[model samples]
Target: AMFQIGKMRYVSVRDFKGKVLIDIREYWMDPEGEMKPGRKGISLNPEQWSQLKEQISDIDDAVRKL
Candidate 1:
């Protein structure tokens, strides 16, 4: 299944239990507010979500230094 949010399209891969994977893909909006594909997808898991959250803080610190 798939859905759009702002400039991103999220596709899900689920099993009998529930969603097991999500694919984050790029989306672009045209002048008339129409959306189009921008790029490929990036797959993420629970571990990746945790790691990304941790790295986001590091990115914030780096941004604050500049």
Candidate 2:
């Protein structure tokens, strides 16, 4: 499921080749004024996804601190 987080910003999953890739790349208007994805974001693999989860609670605490 892809969802927008900010202006033209979205996260989506792609099954490129024989693997699944989770990406959060931003979009921008190009030459013809059509929106497209840029290469300025992150892509997380499954192991990295798990690592992200491990940091979630810590970030949650940090989030609350703000």
Candidate 3:
């Protein structure tokens, strides 16, 4: 008998000091939120962090502008 492969995904969000944080991505069939051997998960680097800050800031500004 043979078993087919499967995939798993997760989305997490948190609130910090009135800031809205949203994270949505896909991961492997593992439940742990880490990059382990034979498992794939989303990874964010320093540059990505900076970009996210900018994007969120812009969004906030736009909301306030309206």
Per residue, candidate 1 scores C-alpha lDDT tens digits across 1-66 of: 567554456554444356465556776678999766566777777577668778998899999999
The residue pairs that clash in candidate 2, if any, are none
**Any runs in candidate 1 off by more than 4 Å, and if so which?**
1-19, 28-38
- Would you list the clashing residue pairs of candidate 1? none
Q: In terms of lDDT, which candidate is stronger, 1 or 2?
A: 2
Which ranking of candidates, highest lDDT first? Answer: 2, 1, 3
Candidate 1, 52: how far from true, in Å? 0.5
Off by over 4 Å in 3: 1-41, 61-66
How do the residues 1-66 of candidate 2 rate in per-residue lDDT, one tens digit apiece?
577889989887877787887878898989998778888989987788779889999999999999
The clash count for each model shown is 0, 0, 0
- Weakest lDDT window of 10 consecutive positions for candidate 1: 10-19
Residue by residue across 22-59, what tens digits does model 3's lDDT show?
Answer: 44455444366753223333434446656877799789
Candidate 1 global Cα RMSD: 5.1
